[PDB]
Ligand binder design. Structure first.
Ligand SMILES: Nc1nc2c(ncn2[C@@H]2O[C@H](COP(=O)(O)OP(=O)(O)O)[C@@H](O)[C@H]2O)c(=O)[nH]1
Lengths: 56, 420
């Protein structure tokens, strides 16, 4: 019974670390999508500025 | 971040400032259209760049220059505050009578340009001392802005006339008049002359016909190399205030000499080395500076050396220590370790090293002396006074102005006599 309890708690801790690494995957994806967002918005800003200034 | 503004007045001021913007654009890699190929420039749509600068004069003829010479499409069209009469070589026309009418608009532009900053590190202005537009408007602007921004500090590259070169016959008047208050509310007056530049381009570069172009190019490159160590990563960084402690022991003894290194012609460039020993031997002499005042006839209260490029800090440090304890007489003894060094990590465009030698010395006091000389022989007889008092400016001021000068030079001589 001691061996079984040890094995079960080991598996539970493994599941914990697995979910933690899942959340870290998600966080890195979030950061990179935010960088995509900001660069695309910068190019859109340059586009609107050209459109407004060349408006003679 | 630690941004700097640019005011350039007068003919010589505008010329040198245009050349300086040219050199900077060629350093940061900015072609005359304002593209790449916050310390000095500001961003603009389509990745364009606007130089942070204000150009002022009482005659718009200089417009021609700043629109003909390269890098003329950079500046802002609202940053051209021009007059119509022209001060015409007279100080009064540009500080009491007419310049006192556009100086307020210049102040408004200064406010509209400084509020766009987030950390304003200081000011830098370039102007003559006899040029009515330059001296008058620049001194009035300095007065106003220092009465406006007491925290910030101004570093003016004023270009004094040395009598060994004759340009106009009323310089001493405007020179002393501007000095009367330039020692008052200015913290770094790096003086420059023309005799030093002529002697340089004759007996140091073997040039055939020394022309204003290359003279201005040299002084502008020196002006850049002065503060470059903040525009880039460095091993021992500096700013416009780490000089304002290492080089101002007293709130008036702030008159600086400037020297640039290295300087050679084509053949000399081929057949010589570029190392700490040679640059040091090149910079501590007399005729590698831009002041017609023989420094070996005085001393240096303090001397900063901004190196540029990449080297071994031990080497430059030992060279500084050695050149000090060998020139112990020509340095001042009542102060310890009167020399300073500062190393960046990026050399200029063209070479692999650079050295800007800035000096708060006690030799240039003599300079004032000689100018004062002419003053007396143009005041004892009250000569050429019927152009000044006829513009509201009371004559009495002039007198006490000269008195003030005395105090200044007195201080220097007094500190040349101190011991422990
Ligand atoms: N290094 C250099 N100095 C100049 C140049 N032009 C004028 N200076 C000096 O500037 C002095 C007077 O200042 P200036 O701005 O020309 O007078 P203003 O514009 O009429 O008020 C003149 O006496 C010249 O000696 C130049 O092109 N290069």
């Amino acid at each position: 019974i001691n061996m079984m309890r040890g094995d079960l708690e080991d598996n539970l801790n493994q599941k914990r670390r697995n979910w933690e690494k899942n959340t870290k995957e998600f966080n890195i994806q979030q950061r990179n999508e935010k960088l995509d967002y900001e660069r695309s918005s910068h190019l859109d800003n340059q586009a609107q500025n050209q459109y407004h200034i060349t408006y003679c | 971040m630690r941004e700097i503004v640019h005011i350039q007045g007068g003919q010589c001021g505008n010329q040198i400032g245009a050349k300086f913007w040219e050199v900077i654009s060629d350093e940061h890699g900015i072609d005359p259209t304002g593209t790449y190929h916050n310390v000095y420039y500001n961003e603009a749509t389509g990745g364009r760049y606007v130089p942070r600068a204000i150009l002022m004069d009482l005659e718009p003829g200089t417009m021609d220059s700043v629109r003909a010479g390269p890098f003329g499409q950079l500046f802002r069209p609202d940053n051209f505050v021009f007059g119509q009469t022209g001060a015409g070589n007279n100080w009064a026309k540009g500080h009491y009578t007419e310049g006192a009418e556009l100086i307020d608009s210049v102040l408004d532009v200064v406010r509209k340009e400084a509020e766009g900053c987030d950390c304003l590190q200081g000011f830098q202005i370039t102007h003559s001392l006899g040029g009515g537009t330059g001296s008058g408007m620049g001194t009035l602007l300095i007065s106003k802005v220092r009465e406006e921004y007491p925290d910030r500090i101004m570093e003016t590259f004023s270009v004094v006339p040395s009598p060994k070169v004759s340009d106009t016959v009323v310089e001493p008047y405007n020179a002393t008049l501007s000095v009367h208050q330039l020692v008052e509310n200015a913290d770094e007056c790096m003086v420059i002359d023309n005799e030093a530049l002529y002697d340089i381009c004759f007996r140091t570069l073997k040039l055939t016909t020394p022309t204003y172009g290359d003279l201005n190019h040299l002084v502008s490159a020196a002006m850049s190399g002065v503060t470059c160590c903040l525009r880039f990563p460095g091993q021992l960084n500096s700013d416009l205030r780490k000089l304002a402690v290492n080089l101002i022991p007293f709130p008036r003894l702030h008159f600086f000499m400037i020297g640039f290194a290295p300087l050679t012609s084509r053949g000399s460039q081929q057949y010589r080395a570029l190392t700490v020993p040679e640059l040091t031997q090149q910079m501590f002499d007399a005729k590698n500076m831009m002041c017609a005042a023989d420094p070996r006839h005085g001393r240096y209260l303090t001397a900063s050396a901004l190196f540029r490029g990449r080297m071994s800090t031990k080497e430059v440090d030992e060279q500084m220590l050695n050149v000090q304890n060998k020139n112990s007489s020509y340095f001042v003894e009542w102060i310890p370790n009167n020399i300073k060094s500062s190393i960046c990590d990026i050399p200029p465009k063209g070479l692999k090293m650079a050295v800007t030698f800035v000096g708060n010395s006690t030799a240039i006091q003599e300079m004032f002396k000689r100018v004062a000389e002419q003053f007396t022989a143009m005041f004892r007889r009250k000569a050429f006074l019927h152009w000044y008092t006829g513009e509201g400016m009371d004559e009495m001021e002039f007198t006490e102005a000269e008195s003030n000068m005395n105090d200044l030079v007195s201080e220097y001589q007094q500190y040349q006599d101190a011991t422990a």
